[PDB]
Design a protein around this ligand. Structure first.
Ligand SMILES: COc1cnc(C(=O)Nc2ccc(F)c([C@@]3(C)N=C(N)O[C@@H]4C[C@@H]43)c2)cn1
Length: 379
């Protein structure tokens, strides 16, 4: 899959995108890779922030579904006209498939002023597709119409500075990680839902009822920047992180994401900030494994601070009302295999993760963990 290595680009905090083509003749677009949604939606009108957009009038293979859909998010929205067309991934498998496309005709707070992507590739399952689960997601169409294997892997490489990485479509590139992959079940095929069974800060268990870690769900989401934690879990984690880093004091607003903290260039005290370990449900009864990230993952650089000359950072762990979200803060530490065929997600140490001479991100197992099924939330 050497053809697909390094096929992701982006700017810090603006997402990771892959090049795709739509229509006949092919129209090239940059598309955000989002494992947290399930629609393929592209700009189709000249929004001023867009480098380019889908022009259905130029595509002889465009087919109109005579249906629209309005997609609101917590902050933002897009509305689109549904259709199908031929889609390919130039630095992906050598195939072309007919896929659903939402031609975005109005939006608010969706496209990013200054970004270099024009659409979104929702890689999750049909249950959360908009308007309903009859709108087949792109990857489902890809696997159904071709011999591409039913899995993909993501290496997101962090540190506006340019980011990169690889989306290996239909397989795994073993050069992108070290050590072994460790797999956790996909609890249910809607989001990429997983179950966290234990949380440690610098090896110190938070000792909460593990149900709190997954209230009301835990997901793997390449389309979210932060590690988002349920409120109660966030409180305990911040308390422990504060205690571990107490040799230096920071305003309450920093831990709440309400202000940055800046240090003189090259003087960030990485060593005073703890590592964070999430134990995930393993493949075997009573067996778990843990993934461990560094402050280099969860203290993110903010480069566009005009009013400062120093190196400023955002605390990128935040509280959530929709459950745990393992966003870029987690994924930038690891090579992540979305093994749809076996309903499991694999983690391994990423060969491109950011670290220092004293600590590295880690994936370790096996551990003995009992009552892991009780950790999952049910209504
Ligand atoms: C450093 O990492 C990242 C990762 N992602 C981004 C990013 O802009 N994502 C983005 C933009 C628009 C948007 F509508 C969504 C939705 C569809 N997807 C997800 N998963 O969640 C929210 C439901 C919204 C996500 C930036 N930086």
């Amino acid at each position: 899959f050497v053809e697909m290595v390094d096929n992701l680009r982006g700017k810090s905090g603006q997402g990771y995108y892959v090049e795709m083509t739509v229509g006949s003749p092919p129209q090239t677009l940059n598309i955000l890779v989002d494992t947290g949604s399930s629609n393929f939606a592209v700009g189709a009108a000249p929004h001023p922030f867009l480098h380019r957009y889908y022009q259905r009038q130029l595509s002889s293979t465009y087919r109109d579904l005579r249906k629209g859909v309005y997609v609101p998010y917590t902050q933002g929205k897009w509305e689109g006209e549904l259709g199908t067309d031929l889609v390919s991934i130039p630095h992906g498998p050598n195939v072309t498939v007919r896929a659903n496309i939402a031609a975005i005709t109005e939006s608010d707070k969706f496209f990013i002023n200054g970004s270099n992507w024009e659409g979104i590739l929702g890689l999750a399952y049909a249950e959360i597709a908009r308007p309903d689960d009859s709108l087949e997601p792109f990857f489902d169409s890809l696997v159904k119409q071709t011999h591409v294997p039913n899995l993909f892997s993501l290496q997101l490489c962090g540190a506006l500075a340019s980011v990169g990485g690889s989306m290996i479509i239909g397989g795994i590139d073993h050069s992108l990680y070290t050590g072994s992959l460790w797999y956790t079940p996909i609890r249910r095929e809607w989001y990429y839902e997983v179950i966290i069974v234990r949380v440690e800060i610098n090896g110190q268990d938070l000792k909460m009822d593990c149900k709190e870690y997954n209230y009301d769900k835990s997901i793997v989401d390449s389309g979210t920047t932060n590690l988002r934690l349920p409120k109660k879990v966030f409180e305990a984690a911040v308390k422990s992180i504060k205690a571990a880093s107490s040799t230096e004091k920071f305003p309450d607003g920093f831990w709440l994401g309400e202000q940055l903290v800046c240090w003189q260039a090259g003087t960030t005290p990485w060593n005073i900030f703890p590592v964070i370990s999430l134990y995930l449900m393993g493949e075997v009864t009573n067996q778990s494994f843990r993934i461990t990230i560094l402050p280099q993952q969860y203290l993110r650089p903010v480069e566009d601070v005009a009013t400062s000359q120093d190196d400023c950072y955002k605390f990128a762990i935040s509280q959530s009302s929709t459950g745990t979200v393992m966003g870029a803060v987690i994924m930038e530490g690891f090579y992540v295999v979305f093994d749809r065929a076996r309903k499991r997600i694999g983690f391994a140490v990423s060969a491109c993760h950011v670290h220092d001479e004293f600590r590295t991100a880690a994936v370790e197992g096996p551990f003995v963990t009992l009552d892991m099924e009780d950790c999952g939330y049910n209504i």
